[PDB]
Every structure is written in structure tokens, then in C-alpha cells.
């Protein structure tokens with residue numbers, strides 16, 4: 176009951192910087208984004224200037240803490256090998272699971288086609304999320320496999 180648009184996904188947000196543009200995902204009431212994108216330099220959001228609360232160059236994980244009361248996604252708890260990757264253009268593609276942090280792409284495409292989609296959260300067909308996109312893997316510019324961080328790893332950083 177009511178009128179609304181773009182109801183396909185509500186846990187995915189879009190953010191653009193002065194020289195780079197990536198996306199962020201709300202997980203466990205905490206917004207997570209890629210660190211190589213923002214980097215040490217801070218970035219102004221919708222509320223205004225903010226300070227990075229979580230940082231990790233080795234894990235390429237960074238984000239901010241949000242207040243409770245907002246819907247959040249959960250880790251995958253159904254052993255779903257097939258996962259869908261969210262792209263900046265709202266595209267959907269099935270990906271086979273070939274490792275905890277590394278997988279294989281069904282359709283081989285150039286890095287440029289999959290460029291500008293960092294932060295795209297991967298959600299299994301059950302509805303739960305497995306992690307977020309981090310870096311693309313290619314031999315001569317063609318991406319055949321993809322690497323992403325699991326949600327469990329993010330929890331370890333938040334605890335510390």
C-alpha cells in the first residue's frame with residue numbers, strides 16, 4: 176500500500192568522488208566501502224565531512240558506524256555456491272564459488288566492463304549476502320575470476 180520506485184534493492188547506495196566513483200553497502204547497521212577507492216584521504220558524504228572509523232590497506236576494508244534502526248543484510252547461511260554480483264549499472268550475473276575469497280566469472284569480460292562497480296554486494300539466491308566486490312583478476316585485461324572479502328572477515332575488523 177503506497178507509491179514508490181526502485182524497490183528492487185534498498186541496501187545498496189551509490190556514491191561518487193571527485194576522481195573516483197564506488198558504491199557502499201549497509202551490513203550489520205554499518206556502511207562498508209572499499210579502502211583503495213577512498214584511501215587515507217577523507218571524503219564528504221550527505222551529512223557532511225566524516226572521519227573513517229575502520230581502515231585496512233592489507234584487507235582493503237574501510238567503512239563507518241551507523242546508528243541502529245536501519246535494515247541490514249546478513250552473511251550467507253545456506254551453502255549457496257551460485258552468487259549474483261551487483262554492478263553500478265544494476266546488472267546481475269551468476270558467479271560460481273571457487274574459493275572462500277576467490278571465485279570464477281561465468282562470462283569472461285574486459286576489466287573496463289566491470290570497472291566502477293566496487294562495493295557491489297554479492298547476494299546468494301536465498302537472499303543472504305556473502306560479501307562485497309574488492310578487486311578484479313585478469314591476465315591481459317580480461318577478467319575471468321573475481322576476488323571478494325567474506326562478511327566474517329569484516330566482523331573481525333569491527334571487533335578490533
Ligand SMILES: C=C[C@@H]1C[C@]1(NC(=O)[C@@H]1C[C@@H]2CN1C(=O)[C@H](C1CCCC1)NC(=O)O[C@@H]1CCC[C@H]1CCCCCc1nc3ccccc3cc1O2)C(=O)NS(=O)(=O)C1CC1
Pocket residue numbers: 195196197198209210211212231232233234235286287289290291292293308309310311312313316322
Ligand atoms: C574492475 C573493477 C575492480 C573493482 C576495482 N578494483 C581494482 O581495479 C583493483 C584495485 C587495484 C587494482 N585492482 C585489481 O583488481 C587488479 C586489476 C588488473 C588490471 C587492472 C587492475 N587485479 C589484481 O590485483 O588481481 C590480483 C590477481 C590475484 C587476485 C587479485 C588480488 C588483488 C588484491 C589487491 C587489490 C587492491 N587493494 C588495495 C588495498 C589498499 C590500497 C590500495 C589497493 C590497490 C589494489 O589494486 C575498481 O573498480 N576499483 S576503483 O578504485 O576504480 C573503485 C571506484 C570503483
Ligand SMILES: [Zn+2]
Pocket residue numbers: 250251252253254255299300301302303304
Ligand atoms: Zn544465502
